[PDB]
Amino acid sequence: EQEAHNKALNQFKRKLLEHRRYDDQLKQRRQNIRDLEKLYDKTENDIKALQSIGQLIGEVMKELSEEKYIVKASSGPRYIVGVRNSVDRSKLKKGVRVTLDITTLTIMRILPRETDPLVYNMTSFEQGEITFDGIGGLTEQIRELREVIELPLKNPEIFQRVGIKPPKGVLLYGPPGTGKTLLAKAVAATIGANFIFSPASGIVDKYIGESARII
C-alpha cells in the first residue's frame, strides 16, 4: 500500500459494492411483481368466464310480435323467446344467429353466422401445387378451362357485352392419371380465390339429412 489509511478504504470499498448491489436487488423485485401480475390476470380472466354461463344459439325463424320472436334452435326444437333492450328490431333480420340464455332464454345480442367444422378442413388443403403451365400438351385444355372460370370471375363486365347467361360449371372426365385433380389444384393456386376441395365422402354422415345440410 500507500498508507495505513488504505486499511480504512479496504472496509469502505465493501460498503460501496453493497450499495450498488442493493440497487440491483431493487430492480430484481420490480421485475418479480410484474411477472406475478400477469399470473393473477391469467386467472382473473378465468374467474370471469367461470361465473358467467354459456349461451345457446338460435336463429330468427320468424318474427311474431314486438317482444316475442320465434326461433329455430341449432339443437332443434322451436321456441318463443324474448328480447332484452340490448338488441333492436331494426338490427334483427331472419337467418341471423341470435344468442339465448340457458336460464331464461332471452336474446341479449346479435351473433355472426356459423359455418361447418367440416368445411374448414377443405380450406386447409392447398398442397399439390403446380405452375400455370403444369400439364404438358394439355395446355390447350387450360385455355378452355379459364373461359368459363377465370375470366367472368375476375370481370363479369365484359360478358354483358356478349349478352349471354352467366357461365357456370365444368366437368372433367378421362381415365385415371390425366391430372383432373392436378388441373383442379392449378386453377386454385393461379386464381388465388377461396378454395375447397371437397372429399366425396367427408360430406356424408351416418344420419341421412345431415349429409344434405353440409352442402
Partner 1 sequence: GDDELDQEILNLSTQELQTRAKLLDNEIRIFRSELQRLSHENNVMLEKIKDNKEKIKNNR
Partner 2 sequence: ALMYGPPGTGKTLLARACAAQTNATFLKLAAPQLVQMYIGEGAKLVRDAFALAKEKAPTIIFIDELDAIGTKR
Ligand X SMILES: Nc1ncnc2c1ncn2[C@@H]1O[C@H](COP(=O)(O)OP(=O)(O)OP(=O)(O)O)[C@@H](O)[C@H]1O
Residue 67 to residue 64: CA distance in whole angstroms: 8
33 contact choice in partner 2, ligand X, partner 1, none (CB below 5 to 8 Å, kind-dependent): partner 1
The contact mask relative to partner 2 for 189-208 (x = CB under 8 A, - = no) is: ------------xx-xxxx-
126 contacts partner 2 (rule: CB under 8 A): no
CB closer to partner 1, 20 vs 143: 20
Which span (46-54, 67-75, 92-100, 128-136) binds partner 1, by CB under 8 A? 46-54
176 contact choice in ligand X, partner 2, partner 1, none (CB below 5 to 8 Å, kind-dependent): ligand X
Residue 169 to residue 153: CA distance in whole angstroms: 12
128 contact choice in partner 1, ligand X, partner 2, none (CB below 5 to 8 Å, kind-dependent): ligand X
In the chain, the DSSP E strands lie at 55-63, 69-73, 79-83, 97-101, 106-107, 110-111
Of the candidates 76, 77, 169, 176, which one interacts with ligand X according to CB under 6 A? 176
CB closer to ligand X, 81 vs 185: 185
Residue 196 to residue 146: CA distance in whole angstroms: 18
Sign of the C-alpha dihedral computed for residues 10, 12, 13 and 14 taken in this order: positive
Give the 3-state secondary structure of residue 63.
Answer: strand
Q: What is the 3-state secondary structure (H, E, C) of 144-200?
A: HHHHHCHHHHHCHHHHHHHCCCCCCCCCCCCCCCCCHHHHHHHHHHHHCCCCCCCCC
At 68, list the grid cell: 316475442
Contact set with ligand X (CB under 6 A):
128, 135-136, 176-182
Contact set with partner 1 (CB under 8 A):
1-3, 5-6, 8-9, 11-13, 15-20, 22-23, 25-26, 29-30, 32-33, 36-37, 39-40, 43-44, 46-47, 50
